[PDB]
RNA sequence: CGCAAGGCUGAAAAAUUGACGGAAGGGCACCACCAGGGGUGGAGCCUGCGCGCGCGCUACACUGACAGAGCCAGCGAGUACUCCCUUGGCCGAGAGGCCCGGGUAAACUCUGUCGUGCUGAGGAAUCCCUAGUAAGCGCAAGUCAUCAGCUUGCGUUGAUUACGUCCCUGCCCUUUGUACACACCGCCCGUCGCUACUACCGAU
């Protein structure tokens, strides 16, 4: 902000900062620097954490149950199992968080949907 | 992959709604910047908003960049505008006729980078699935009445708009003999658009000119020998496809090489071909009182 | 006219015209339902001679009546009696005097005379969710029917 | 205004009925009955469009804890001929132990 | 329509989208990759470049190298 | 061949598009038609003005191919309706 | 309101950067070759386009007819849907309502009975087509444009032959650029323009 408004490096680093924060999912728009004024927030980081983002994705029911499930280790993010309940899930890894391989929670979901393939 | 398409479409719709609210605020912020430079007194409801001034000090620069045109608007085409060659497949309805298949070939040859696909027994969600699975930019569906085509459906992918249009006055390439016609040249075509002035007209201009691969801008004003013309009167966009030689610096000889349409659009939906429940952006309002008087595009 | 087959929008309308020549003259005309549904005459129908296809605004019912409001010109008659009273003159009578003299009743249509309409209260069917959609939608919004 | 109109200005216009040669088809739907029909159809289509959005944007790995105390909608193959997409609910009955049925049958 | 085409071709203005360079942002001059007061404002710009190097390293390391 | 290539070849044959001749070549041309051929070129290379079949005649009889002009016929019919 | 709003007049260039080619070498193409398949074109019906033309539809027999047995789908639910018009009679002062007459598949599999019998699969051309593709089959819908003389979905059964090459027909492009190591190549060719200078020719 304190740079002059027609500055090239100001414009380039505004677009870089907004694109970085929108790719990490903290901001919901990438067209205002007042988003980084009063919308970037430790609560925005803490809701980009893993048990809250799988509460939102409805992998669990509540953030307490989600922290219990990812402490017991049913949740992988991508291809690697995640035991840390503070792993910050970015906007393009929210498409890859899912259950682990031999999960009893996955067997519970398939047994509910009556698609329990035992092979 | 499918979760990524759904997530990116939802993020796009949320960003568009936030842009609506931010435009409602930024119409007020552009009065504060113009009053600061010119010294004309402004409204008290604008000059006495502390949040507006406090955030204006950070958000000057994007308004200046939009005034200079240095940035581009959040759009489904602005992500890959002149970077990727848009690949596009043309398909028929389910059981095509021979003249519909030859017409599908003709409007495949209209685009230099298109491919044609045989429908046969191909369910339409799996058609959309295979398009997103092979990263196609556009699909175009064709519908015939009885050996004569009556509808196009131009759908942009991954989640872009459909333009459904009905065709009239179709004169096929496959009616004239091979002694008079020939193999159409496949060079990157120039495009001209005539008569689009509303923002809806610029919308249909965008979703029609992002079907063609981008022209090399070094010497494009004189090189290239093939032109495609979209000109609308009474919101029925009429399209010709010519090939030309510049027989002098003052004169040019045209030669009609492709099919002639006068397509009329009747539906522009912000959502792909599978979504029948997508939110429409415009539709041809028949059976209203002044829907025949009012001209869009 | 009267609807014959009723699809979602396009309805076939029967007792209005007599031939495809008359329909081809009245092609594109603004047809209307009694209820208020607008529509347009689209195409003459081949196999029953005198029917046509008209695409309406929403779905019309078989009880509905489909009208087309044309404007036919009426020319006045060129009659002129002078009222030469001191000589004598023939006075043309009125329609009531003509009917009472030559004994013909006034034309009265029972379909035209106003009646009281017994409207039952319109109750509609409940929502009928399809099986595949009702099996595909998620757990928080799954339908629970004993 | 309202005082610049006669009683014949105020007089109501009557509604025509269905013709008597066509009264078996039901009532003649006018603007009011058509408005009721259109309201009911737009409401049902709004609910169905929201259900189609919810069935499209469904996480395939979701896990609620009612799934361990409910029977799912299944498929036509797993359920059978008696397959509706509705999750079956409980009528309140329960399998009853032998001592309590001994008590009930002594009473009967 | 034919005369409109001839006018555009002669006084050639075409509405085709043009091929832009994919690195117009970071490399605006388009250099070739082979053989080759105001001091207050320059000091402020270099301070913002230093701050952004530190902050981009922290944000990529906090998103755990998915960026 | 292509329509572009055959258009260029016919205009090179008619001498409308060829290389810039010198004054000596113009002397040879003034030492030693083309509108009548340009009319045929502008009719042949714009084949959509008139309606043609592609197959040709079904049964060949030898005895001594534009079959209709829809644009001119529609304009003529609209003038009749105007009158 | 002021300017615009006064007719040497009477319809049909730029270039030190330009104009057009040729030869060599590449890339691609069911508008190319190669191997096959399928339409249309023969008879009848009809939308449409301008008597003609195709696009669909139907009939044309070994892939047969008759009688049985068994066994398979998917999309589809607006108090909403109905094919006519009539001979009579009922109850109808009259308008009507009644009654009786006249005009969830196809396919497939198995088992038997009879046996080519006006009871004949489309010429020259021309076009299209490479995997759940060609082709057969039915079921459903009728979504503000188009479409009932049909349209669009949806399932079912599911092959032959290419999947190489630029030889033919063409299309695009290199011979300037756009990156640097290894490694390789080694001044493509023609007809004119334009500019600068030099001298020539002959009238004023």
Swiss-Prot record, chain D:
Q: Which residues form the signal peptide?
A: none
Q: Where is this region: Disordered?
A: 1-24
Q: Name the residue ranges with Basic and acidic residues bias.
A: 15-24
Its subcellular locations are:
Nucleus, Nucleolus
Question: How does the record describe its quaternary structure?
Answer: Component of the ribosomal small subunit (SSU) processome composed of at least 40 protein subunits and snoRNA U3. Interacts with snoRNA U3.
Functional note: Involved in nucleolar processing of pre-18S ribosomal RNA.
Family label: Belongs to the UTP11 family.
> Which protein are we looking at?
U3 small nucleolar RNA-associated protein 11
Span covered, complete protein? 1 to 108 of 270
